[PDB]
Amino acid sequence: GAMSCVYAFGSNGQRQLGLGHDEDMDTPQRSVPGDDGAIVRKIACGGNHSVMLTNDGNLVGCGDNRRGELDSAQALRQVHDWRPVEVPAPVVDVACGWDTTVIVDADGRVWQRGGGCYEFTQQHVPLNSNDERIAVYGCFQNFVVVQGTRVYGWGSNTKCQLQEPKSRSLKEPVLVYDTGSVAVDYVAMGKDFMVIVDEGGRIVHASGRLPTGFELKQQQKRHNLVVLCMWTSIHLWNARLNTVESFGRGTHSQLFPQERLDFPIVGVATGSEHGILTTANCYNVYCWGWGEHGNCGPQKGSQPGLQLVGQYSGKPRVFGGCATTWIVL
């Protein structure tokens, strides 16, 4: 047994917190998927909907359904509580856009629903390894599928983030970057930018519309970095200096407090426009950035600094979303 203990707070206009009600929360609220809960592997957050992947490959979701984010029904404008999302095969990875949801099954296939599509339509990405590791990432209007060394993606190419030539929209996924005798760890994505990070902890490739201050040239010499991106900012977890280097036009305190920290950082996570910090003491969880919907805590004035939102006995897994915050024990 041993189910996951999920806490959720922040934007709740479409009941995307899975609490049943539509009230914006400033304090962590216990979110339980159906009866007797479930074991959570990862939480993918959309614009106004939430998706939760279990260890057995099943999906559960709640939130806006006016664009076909969750259920296959034009009449169903909103999913009230945690309801099972139909999948063609056991899901091993999940991601979400503004009004879309993509998955990766055990067979390796990529399926996408939302944005007008109420059925999981298969996305054809070019590959020939089939049995390495197919991970998927997404943000706003862009998705990225990563397998070993290859990195593919589709969606909006307005700020020239998907391909070298400028464009408008790409439906069929293309190769955005290729290594190189080194596997790609993850891909930190922004609203209109992208950062590719390898397993060595180095920055290998970036995309169009990079935030001010962030220069690709002087950052590719760095070793052992954890890259996290919001919509208009890039954040670097510096374990040696015990801080978070922030770059970008941060009007709503998106910039991590330059003031020296107190406790060692054991986790950093970002949402659409807010950051979530986890330090070790007991484990404390902090939040900074654009927290109007209470996604940063009781203080919804979006003031700079770090405010405590919870203290836990064990190390929590943290997921960020569009003005939402997820804490999993």
Curated annotation (Swiss-Prot):
Consequence of substituting residue 98 to A: Slightly reduced interaction with KTI11
Classification via InterPro entries: Ran_GTPase-activating, RCC1/BLIP-II, Reg_chr_condens
Alphabetic keyword roster: Cytoplasm, Repeat, tRNA processing
One GO molecular-function entry: ubiquitin protein ligase activity
Protein name (database record): Protein KTI13
GO cellular component entries: cytoplasm
Underlying gene: ATS1
Organism: Saccharomyces cerevisiae (strain ATCC 204508 / S288c) (Baker's yeast)
Function: Together with KTI11; associates with the elongator complex and is required for tRNA Wobble base modifications mediated by the elongator complex. Association with the elongator complex is mediated via interaction with KTI11. The elongator complex is required for multiple tRNA modifications, including mcm5U (5-methoxycarbonylmethyl uridine), mcm5s 2U (5-methoxycarbonylmethyl-2-thiouridine), and ncm5U (5-carbamoylmethyl uridine). Together with KTI11; also required for diphthamide biosynthesis; diphthamide is a post-translational modification of histidine which occurs in elongation factor 2.
A Pfam family of this chain: RCC1_2
Renumbered ranges of RCC1 repeats: 3-55, 57-106, 148-199, 282-329
Subcellular location: Cytoplasm
Subunit architecture: Interacts with KTI11/DPH3; the interaction is direct.
GO biological process, one term: protein histidyl modification to diphthamide
